[model samples]
Target chain A: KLTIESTPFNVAEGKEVLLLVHNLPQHLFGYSWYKGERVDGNRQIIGYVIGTQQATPGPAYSGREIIYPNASLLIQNIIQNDTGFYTLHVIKSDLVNEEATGQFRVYP
Target chain B: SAPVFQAGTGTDSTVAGVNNEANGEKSSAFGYENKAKEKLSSAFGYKNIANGIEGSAFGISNLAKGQYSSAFGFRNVANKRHSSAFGSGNEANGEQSSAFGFKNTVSGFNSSAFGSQYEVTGNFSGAFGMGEFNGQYQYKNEGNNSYMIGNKNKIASGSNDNFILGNNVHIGGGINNSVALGNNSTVSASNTVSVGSSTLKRKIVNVGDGAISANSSDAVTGRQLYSGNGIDTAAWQNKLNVTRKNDYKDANDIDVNKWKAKL
Candidate 1:
């Protein structure tokens, strides 16, 4: 079972947010984050590989997002438009992926 | 706090995409090489730009340079005041205008063009229909208060107050206050409404009883014509009564000697 826990679901503009991953499956190869409900590669914000710890920014990646070693998403100076559903895709050693979604709200 | 992973400083390390130099008053920008150059504007996706106050651009290569304008989808442009462009490759270049669907343009003030490859170049007009996806089947509206809402419909330039609906309808040739209301219907004269072409005629059904008087402009129905025909007796009965007269009655006696003396 894969799940994501937002540190604070509701946030004000120009604030930092962290999306903490819980119950990550064993033998994890890589993981990626998406902005909306789609797990498509076009909407991916960022992804990180396990062995090289290499981070690649996707088409939806802004300058303020950062992926930590523990698969936590840390966004600096979050804007109002960032308030939406965020999906996480966890790729495992079996080449299969587990997914979870979480919501965030931002106020002006 | 950071000892295990030392990223973004050595070889094979990657950084965030879009090296942004955007500076604005409370504006936001994201994605590869995007720009939000004014206050309260936002730009998202690859190489998109929003240069006006409170403008927004979303999707790849879209631009919103008008005040309070918004452009969405790929390569759409909203470059006038209070204009919006949605769907791929649309242009809303008129003041207070909107364009939707692919490859359409609205260049008139207070006009809207929707569906594929439509063009509305007149003020206070609107057009919506499905043109060909590859820039065929042209549909256009270029008259004030003119509307074209079907496939391949067109309104002539300066043909004001014209309305055309259904497929392949057109109103042109010095016509005004004209209307075409079905497939292949055309308005060839001023102040006329057509429902079909010259070869194809459509009959009107379910008409109401119109008033019959000296000064009534209402249309007469078929029942009204049948009742006003004055058909009480046959034509031969009136002809016999006038031709023979009462002299041929059986009860009257005929004076044959007086008739021969007079002849």
Candidate 2:
């Protein structure tokens, strides 16, 4: 089972935060991040990180996202709109996958 | 209670000779089998029913089921407060919504469907054109504040704040805040505008006699226009070529015949 580690923390507007993912499988294809009030199938994708490649940011995280070698996501200048539930989709191969979820809040 | 004027053969709620059913109070129902089952309601023509307070049904088989709502044509239904369905087979199912043409449906609050067989399902949105087939029911605007204005046009599902202005234009699903103009245009990208389809050429004609200007660094110069393939020279000469020697001759100038003889 793949696991993600994120603590519910309050941050001021225009601050930065790092969302860490843990317990990823050894052989992975990619990972995608989604944001919504619920970690469901209807969430919006915010960013994606391929294996050892450059991260691709979705519309919500354009020019303000960074992905570490361990596939953790870094977001700068967090705003009130960024406060929500976030889920991660981990792809192992064509048929193997897992998901992990967390939540965060941004104060005005 | 005594009704002013009523005529029907079915058993009614009001006094004898009134067409309303037993539950109607301070209401009037006229024509055969009509039923006004609520207070201050009115139903006219055959088989019509006004089942809510202050509701009205005016044609055959129509239903007005909300307070202050009205249905005016055959087989229409106004099922929400302050709603109206004005033409045959139409339905207004949202509060303060209206459907005005045949077979149309308005399912969004404060929305309007104005032409035949169209459905407006987004709050404060509208669909205003006729469809090609019977009961085709095209033009679904599921996004708030968006509108589709021509026949058979479609906005993206879940897309908000979009506007489509031509027939058969389609903005792909999930694309929001876009606009598509001209017939058969398709916009798949959000915050973009697509005008005309791949096979059709739509021109943006500038009708006024004014100089078209852009930023100085981006303007196309005359020298760049002259530096094309060999066809440029051929086209240039075709417009400015002079063929007649007499067209340039003067009375005291060198004789054209003597110059031709010497050449």
Candidate 3:
């Protein structure tokens, strides 16, 4: 199991927000981010970040993604279409993994 | 008013009203200042003019200047033979053309325009939808046999044999015989059908065999068919033809045939 945290989870359109995760093992490999509205529905890969490297962004995050300290994801200029669930998958050196989910909402 | 002159005892050639003029044989003019200046013509409203043979002008300030033409609304003009302008400020300026809504114009021969402010400038084309400015006009069909349905839609210039059915859709002029079916959808190539755009998703159900190309692969998820980067059935047919030709050549290889005969 993993734990995720977000500040000011609800945002209006054109605002910025952040999502942070904790409880990762010291020997981390990489992590991937996914987004979707429903748990079982189609999830789109938003981006991924390796240890201390720049984030490779996806279509929805083009020119809008920022990697904060401690593997946190910062998004800017959000729109109503960005309201959804974001899941983070943590990878370990030995192929072990943990996952956590966070939610975001954008009002018109 | 009764006719002012007699013509071989056939109900007189000219019938006049107050301040009206009937100047042709069997012509009738009624209302203030109306004129039926040609034979078998009639004008019925204020300052209306029917100057062509067998023409009719029935609304205020309307003009029917073509033979067998009719104008029925205020300030409308029917300027070509067998044309009709039925709504206020409308103009039918092409032979056998009709304009029925306010301010609409049918400038192409055999064309018809029915929505307000719409224009059909291609021969034998028709347009029907609310019209506006700022690239938001309901529909403008300028291609022969091209038809458009929906608000703010457009068929590109010189794109013939095309159809557009949704709001804000545009078919490029370089494309012919195409169909665009959803809002904001565009087809820029000939023999194409674009059902949706980046923001609009369209679902087509119950497609039968040979409707799509036979080269289309099986659906990946049973419920969804994914043609990576989209598929052009015409391109697929071309690829199939090239592949069949290559296979036929390989089957008739002279070196392989010689070796197989020795075996």
Q: Which candidate ranks first by TM-score, i.e. highest?
A: 1
DockQ of 2: 0.01
**Over 4 Å off, model 2:** A1-108, B1-22, B132-139, B207-263
**Residue pairs that clash (backbone atoms under 3 angstroms), model 3:** B138-B152
lDDT of 2 by residue, B126-224 (tens): 888865321123246677889888887766557789998888776666788788888778777888878776678676653433232332334344544
- For each candidate, report its DockQ versus the true two-chain complex: 0.01, 0.01, 0.01
lDDT of 1 by residue, A71-92 (tens): 8999989877888889988877
Better by TM-score, candidate 3 or 1: 1
Please, what is the TM-score per model? 0.57, 0.53, 0.54
Q: How do the residues B100-179 of candidate 3 rate in per-residue lDDT, one tens digit apiece?
A: 87668788978888876677888878887765411112346778888877776666577899877778876666778887
- Native-vs-model 3 lDDT? 0.71
- lDDT values, one for every candidate: 0.78, 0.71, 0.71
Evaluate residue A2 in candidate 1 and report its C-alpha lDDT on the 0 to 100 scale: 74
Q: List candidate 3 stretches off by more than 4 Å.
A: A1-108, B1-11, B133-139, B206-263
> Against the true structure, what is every candidate's RMSD?
21.6, 15.8, 23.8
Question: lDDT tens string, model 3, A1-108?
Answer: 467777677786777898888776677656666675322213434434353353454434456767643768888888777777887766665434666788877877
Question: Candidate 1, which segments miss by more than 4 Å at Cα?
Answer: A1-108, B1-17, B132-137, B229-263
User: Tens digits of per-residue lDDT for model 1 on B112-191?
Assistant: 88787788889999988864321112346878988888787878786899887799776775788987888888678898
